[PDB]
Design a protein around this ligand. Structure first.
Ligand SMILES: CCCCCCCCCCCCCCCCCC(=O)OC[C@H](COP(=O)([O-])OCC(O)COP(=O)([O-])OC[C@@H](COC(=O)CCCCCCCCCCCCCCCCC)OC(=O)CCCCCCCCCCCCCCCCC)OC(=O)CCCCCCCCCCCCCCCCC
Ligand SMILES: Cc1cc2nc3c(=O)[nH]c(=O)nc-3n(C[C@H](O)[C@H](O)[C@H](O)COP(=O)(O)O)c2cc1C
Ligand code: SF4
Lengths: 430, 56
């Protein structure tokens, strides 16, 4: 295919995204979850990993790394240590609510995916690290897990497949950095949410020093549907190497901010004008879009005309597809203030372990506040660009990169706005 | 500079040079001992970007 989008309801995976049906076990079984999962587990690890590989699913976390290869990293004989699946349910990133929606509305999809991924990698348990603020979502998840345990889908006979699997839910305590892979592992282990360096990779030394795999809720939840309907179908959706469906959270200055499920490689204009009701004031009133949550840079209207929603398409557009969180800003937006608020978010959410992110993100927050006030001179724009380049790639984890990229996008596109603010401040003071 | 014209003519004739145009005693042509404050310029490395030390 050449044009992508217009995903059909019979092809949408998260059929209870809007909470209009029963989220409990009876409604999930009516919607088709837990179907032939015993047959899937008896087909076993290699078949499931091959299904994920031929589906070509990439990480919904925002990393974009292939799921089949990442899960086949744990397809090894055991050395006496237990093995663990860990489910990133924190959803800290701004603009993003898709994991919250599918946890509170399709929790049995998440439980079945935990079982399927744990069987595929070889695992005795899945620890779902949920965000600490999602108390009601966590309680709904525990209700679904109790239903699964009572129905025998989980625990000591996984749907009667002679496989033992446990699903635990562990709540966080309010840290965006605990959504990171290794920092999440440390938070489960009970220390501070500080990411650890790689190597060792979590497939070798992870939670409790055991081989483990951290996977996003959307990835885990689409795993059993991929196994049931085949990887060829999921690969048939989307473009080449950007395959399947995706949950987009369109927020900001749109008429209908919403979470929707749409095919990969949908045009951004098509997605907004179809599901968000368009920009407030119109497509001409559109100014900028942050397409992949706060960690991705912004793109102006001119390139937002024709851009697709692929990893590769946004990389060509000098962006990324992060959590598919499309934040829309119109002509009335104080764009410098919005980007400075994002940098203040990263300043408050840095874990402070490593020097470039700690000191530099605090520095960039101060510089961006002065940029909002206009209290700088245009040489500081290139100074801030160089500071962002010093932060990016020099940190333990990718919070430094996710703080450097919005600054780079703002400098790359809206530089005359910054210079105009500095000039207006200079002429109004002197 | 306080010399009379007779002594000035005598000195100029005796030396062969016009001494009054080039006096070896400083009277008023020198700079004032109190000066306005300066503002010294900065060097070429006083810039906020493209100024990595490994390149210079
Ligand atoms: C014979 C020449 C005697 C000297 C003389 O008349 O000099 C005046 C004057 C000196 O000219 P000048 O070199 O231009 O004087 C230096 C300054 O321009 C002007 O000098 P100044 O302005 O710094 O101060 C000058 C002032 C200075 O006043 C004093 O020094 C007063 C001292 C008082 C002490 C008590 O007055 C004088 O010098 C008046 C002349 C004093 C001559 C004294 C001779 C006797 C000395 C003692 C003998 C015992 O003579 C002439 O111009 C012509 C000299 C030849 C005359 C015949
Ligand atoms: C600072 C930071 C915060 C992150 N927060 C989250 C989060 O809240 N939820 C999430 O699923 N992934 C988050 N990630 C991305 C994780 O690396 C990713 O979820 C994890 O690698 C799972 O891999 P996957 O994308 O293949 O599922 C974060 C990454 C960074 C650097
Ligand atoms: S980049 Fe920041 S959040 Fe990540 S390890 Fe370093 S200090 Fe912690």
């Amino acid at each position: 295919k050449t044009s992508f989008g217009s995903l059909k309801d019979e092809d949408r995976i998260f059929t209870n995204l809007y909470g209009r049906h029963d989220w409990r076990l009876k409604g999930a079984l009516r919607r088709g979850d837990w179907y032939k999962t015993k047959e899937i587990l008896l087909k076993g690890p290699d078949w499931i990993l091959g299904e994920m590989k031929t589906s070509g699913l990439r990480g919904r976390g925002g990393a974009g790394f292939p799921t089949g290869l990442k899960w086949s990293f744990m397809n090894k004989p055991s050395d006496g240590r237990p093995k663990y699946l860990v489910v990133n349910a924190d959803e800290g990133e701004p603009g993003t609510c898709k994991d919250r929606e599918i946890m509170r509305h399709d929790p049995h999809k998440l439980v079945e995916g935990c079982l399927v991924g744990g069987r595929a990698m070889g695992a005795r348990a899945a620890y779902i690290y949920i965000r600490g603020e999602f108390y009601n979502e966590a309680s709904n998840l525990q209700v679904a897990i109790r239903e699964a345990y009572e129905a025998g889908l989980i625990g000591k006979n996984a749907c009667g497949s002679d496989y033992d699997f446990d699903v635990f839910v562990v709540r966080g305590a309010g840290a965006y950095i605990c959504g990171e892979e290794t920092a999440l592992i440390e938070s489960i282990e009970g220390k501070q949410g500080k990411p650890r360096l790689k190597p060792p990779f979590p497939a070798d030394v992870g939670v409790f020093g055991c081989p483990t795999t951290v996977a996003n809720v959307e990835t885990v939840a689409v795993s059993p549907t991929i196994c049931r309907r085949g990887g060829t179908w999921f690969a048939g959706f989307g473009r080449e190497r950007n395959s399947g469906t995706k949950l987009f959270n369109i927020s900001g200055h749109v008429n209908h901010p919403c979470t929707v499920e749409e095919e990969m490689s949908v045009p951004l204009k098509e997605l907004i004008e179809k599901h968000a009701g368009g920009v407030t004031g119109g497509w001409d009133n559109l100014l900028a879009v942050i397409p992949g949550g706060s960690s991705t840079p912004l793109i102006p209207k001119s390139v937002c005309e024709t851009v697709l929603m692929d990893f590769d398409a946004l990389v060509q557009a000098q962006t990324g597809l992060g959590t598919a969180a499309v934040i829309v800003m119109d002509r009335s937006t104080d764009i410098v203030k919005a980007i400075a608020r994002l940098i203040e978010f990263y300043k408050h959410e840095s874990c402070g372990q490593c020097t470039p992110c700690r000191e530099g993100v605090d520095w960039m927050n101060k510089v961006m506040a002065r940029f909002v006030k206009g209290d700088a001179r245009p040489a500081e724009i290139d100074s801030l660009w160089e500071i962002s380049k010093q932060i990016e790639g020099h940190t333990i984890c990718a919070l430094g990169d996710g703080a450097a990229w919005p600054v780079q996008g703002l400098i790359r596109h809206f530089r005359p706005e910054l210079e105009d603010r500095m000039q207006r401040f200079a002429q109004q003071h002197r | 500079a306080s010399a009379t014209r007779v002594i000035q003519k005598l000195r100029n004739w005796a030396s062969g040079q016009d001494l009054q145009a080039k006096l070896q005693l400083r009277y008023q042509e020198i700079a004032k001992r109190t000066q306005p404050p300066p503002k010294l310029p900065v060097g070429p490395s006083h810039k906020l970007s493209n100024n990595y030390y490994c390149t210079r």
